Amino acid sequence: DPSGYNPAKNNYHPVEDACWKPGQKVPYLAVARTFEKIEEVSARLRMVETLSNLLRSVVALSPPDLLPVLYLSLNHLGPPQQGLELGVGDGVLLKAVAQARQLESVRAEAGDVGLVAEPPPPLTASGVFSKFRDIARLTGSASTAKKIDIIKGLFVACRHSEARFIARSLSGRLRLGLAEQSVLAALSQAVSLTPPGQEFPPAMVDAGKGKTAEARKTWLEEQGMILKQTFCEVPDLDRIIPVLLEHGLERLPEHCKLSPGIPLKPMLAHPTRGISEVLKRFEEAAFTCEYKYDGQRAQIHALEGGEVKIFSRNQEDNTGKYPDIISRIPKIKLPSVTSFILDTEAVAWDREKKQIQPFQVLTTRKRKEVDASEIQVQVCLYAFDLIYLNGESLVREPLSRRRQLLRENFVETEGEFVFATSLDTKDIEQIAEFLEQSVKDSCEGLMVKTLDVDATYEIAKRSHNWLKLKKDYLTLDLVVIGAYLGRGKRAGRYGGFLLASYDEDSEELQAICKLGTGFSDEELEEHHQSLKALVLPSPRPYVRIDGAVIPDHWLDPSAVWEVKCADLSLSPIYPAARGLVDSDKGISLRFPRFIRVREDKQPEQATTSAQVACLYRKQSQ
DNA sequence: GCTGATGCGTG
DNA sequence: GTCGGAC
DNA sequence: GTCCGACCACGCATCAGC
C-alpha cells in the first residue's frame, strides 16, 4: 500500500491519495516515496508542491507528526540552539551496513552511500526521528558501537528506497535539491490550502479551488511571506509549529515575535564586483562604507533580567565560549538599556600590542571554556547593528535609525567594545581611501549598506541587501599533481584537484592546496579530456604532498593553472614553502578558486615556493 | 593516558 | 567561505 | 535573482585502538 504513494499526482486528494489511515502515524515509506519524487524533478515549483502534498495529508490525518516530517525533510535534529550533533560519518555508516557482508565489500561507494546500503514492523517517521535523536545523544566510551547498533536496526526495517534515504540522512547529505527555503514554501502552501485544526473529515481539503490563476498564486506568495519573515525572527520549528497548528499562519506573527534570548537569522551579504557596481546598485541611494572585520560574528542577546546570551551566524549557542563578554556585558550598555540585541563581530585582540590578530588566532580559542582566566586569545567586539532596544524591536527601522540608537545607548570601551569604523560618502576617491585603509587596518574589505532606502533588518524581503567589496573580487600559477573523484553533483567525473608549487632549492613540487571550485561543467569536461592520458599509477619522486590527501588519480605534472585566493595561511598539513616562514608549517590558500588554464606555461615555469613565502610575508601579517 | 582519525563547525 | 547550474 | 549543492582550509572536541 505505501509502496504506491504518489504525492506528485494531479489533483492530489490529501485524504484519499494518502497511504496511512487517519489518526495513525505517518510511515517513513511515505516520506521516502516523497523524497524519490522530489529528486526525480528539477523545477523547485514541482518540488515545493510534491512536498506540500505530503504536508497536507499530515496536517489532515496525523497533525502531531508534522514537526518530525519537516525536520526529516530539512535533515535536521531540532533547533540550532540545542546543538544536537549526530556524530556519525561515512565510516560508522559503512560498518552498520555490513552488519545487515564485509567492510571492504561495502567500500564500493558508487558517490552515494545510500545505493551501497540497498519481517520487521514498518518504520515510522516519528520513530525514525526519535532514533536519530537517540543516536545524537549517545556520548562517551563505546558510544560508537551503540550508535552502530541503532543504525543496523534501521537498515533491517528498511523497505524499497528507505535504505538509501536513511543512509543519506545520517551521512549529512540528502541531496534533494530542496532546502530550508522550499521547505518553508511547501509548509506555507500546505497550511493555506488545508487549514490545520479541522475535525475529521476535514471540512476543507483544497482551499484554492474557488480561485483564479492569479488569485491563488498571489495568495500563496503573501502567505509564504508571513511565514518566512516570522521564521527569520524565530528560526525554531519547535516554537512555530505548535503555534501554527493552534492559531493559523495569519495570526502566527502575533505570537512568534522577535524576543531576546531566542536567536534570529542575521543579514547576509552579496559580493560587489567593484565601486562601479555598488554605485550602480545603490543609484541615488545613500550608502555607508564600513570595515568588514575578519573574525566570527557574535549576536549578543541581553534578556530582561540580566541573563546574557551569545549566538553565532547559524544560531549556535556560544555563551560558554565567551565568559569575558558575559562579564563585560554591563560595561558596554547604558543605564536605560534593559534589553538589546547587539550585532557584533568578535575578532582576536592583543591587549598588549593593541592590534587585531588574524582569523586563525580566533579559531585557537576554546569552545566550552568554563575558566575565564584560562582564555589566552582575547577578543574585542565590533558592534555594527542593533536589532532590539529596551523591549522594542527595530526590524522595521532603517539603518540610520538603528545606527543612531546604537551610538546613543552603548558606550565605546576602547580595547573591548568599539563601534565599526564607518564613512558615509559617495566620492569614489574617499571610497578607495577607506578601502585601502581597511586593509591597512587589518580588515578583509569594506561592507556597503543603505541607511534608509531598503535598509531595514528584514531577511524575507532580501536576505542579501548588504554589499561585500572584498579585495580578491577585483593570483597564483600552480601545477596539478593529482585528481580526486567527485561526489553527488560531481559523480562520474572529477571533483577536486591537488595543486602544487615548485621549490627551486629542493627541486621538488610541493602541494599547496586543493582546488574544487571556480570552473564550469564545460571547463571541467575540458579538464578531463586534457588531463586524461596523464594518469600515473604511482607518484613521481619529485612530488611531495606531506600530509595532504592522497589523490585518487596521480597525474603526470604537466598542467599549469591560474588560481586566485583571498589570503595565504600557514598550513598544518601542506608542505609548500615549509621552513621559509614557519619552522614546521607550510603555506596554503584561503578560499581558492580556479581561473584559467595556462597553456603557454610548463610546470617549471610556475609560482615558486619562495614566491609563496614572499606573498605570505607581504600580507599585513 | 595518548594518539590518530574524524566529525563538524567556523568561514 | 566561492562557485556554477537550473529554473 | 533565488535556491541549492558541489567544493575549499583549518581549528576544537570526541573516541576507538592502543
Numbering used by the authors: 262 to 361, 364 to 373, 377 to 384, 395 to 750, 756 to 902
Authors' text:
DNA ligase 1 (LIG1) seals broken strand breaks by joining two adjacent ends during DNA replication and repair transactions. LIG1, the main replicative ligase, serves a critical role in the maturation of Okazaki fragments by ligating >50 million nicks during DNA replication and finalizes DNA excision repair pathways by an ultimate ligation step. Furthermore, in line with our previously solved LIG1 structures, we demonstrated that LIG1, which consists of oligonucleotide-binding, DNA-binding, and adenylation domains, completely envelopes the nick. Here, we determined the crystal structures of LIG1/nick DNA complexes with 3′-8-oxodG and 3′-8-oxorG templating A or C during the pre- and post-catalytic steps of the ligation reaction.
In the present study, we further utilized the LIG1EE/AA mutant to crystallize the protein in complex with nick DNA substrates harboring 3′-8oxodG:A, 3′-8oxodG:C, 3′-8oxorG:A, and 3′-8oxorG:C. In addition, we used the LIG1 wild-type (LIG1WT) for crystallization with nick DNA containing 3′-8oxodG:C. We determined the structure of LIG1/nick complex with 3′-8-oxodG:C for both the wild type and the EE/AA mutant. The overlay of LIG1WT/3′-8-oxodG:C and LIG1EE/AA/3′-8-oxodG:C structures revealed no difference in the orientation of 3′-OH with respect to 5′-PO4 at the nick, which also confirms the presence of E346A and E592A amino acid substitutions at the high-fidelity site. We solved the LIG1/nick complexes containing 3′-8-oxodG:A, 3′-8-oxodG:C, and 3′-8-oxorG:C at the pre-catalytic step of the ligation reaction referring to the formation of a DNA–AMP intermediate. We observed Watson–Crick base pairing for 3′-8-oxodG:C and 3′-8-oxorG:C and Hoogsteen base pairing for 3′-8-oxodG:A and 3′-8-oxorG:A. We observed that LIG1WT/3′-8-oxodG:C and LIG1EE/AA/3′-8-oxodG:C moved by 1.3 Å and 1.2 Å, respectively, versus 3′-8-oxodG:A. The deoxyribose of LIG1WT/3′-8-oxodG:C and LIG1EE/AA/3′-8-oxodG:C moved +2T nucleotides by 0.6 Å and 1.8 Å, respectively, leading to shifts of 0.6 Å and 1.2 Å, respectively, at the +2A position of the template. In the ligation assays, we showed the mutagenic ligation of nick DNA substrates with 3′-8-oxodG:A and 3′-8-oxorG:A and an efficient nick sealing of 3′-8-oxorG:C, while the end joining of 3′-8-oxodG:C was greatly compromised by LIG1. Furthermore, 8-oxodG:A base pairing in -syn conformation provides more flexibility at 3′-8-oxodG toward the 5′-PO4 of the nick, whereas 8-oxodG:C base pairing in -anti conformation restrains the movement of 3′-8-oxodG toward the 5′-PO4 of the nick.
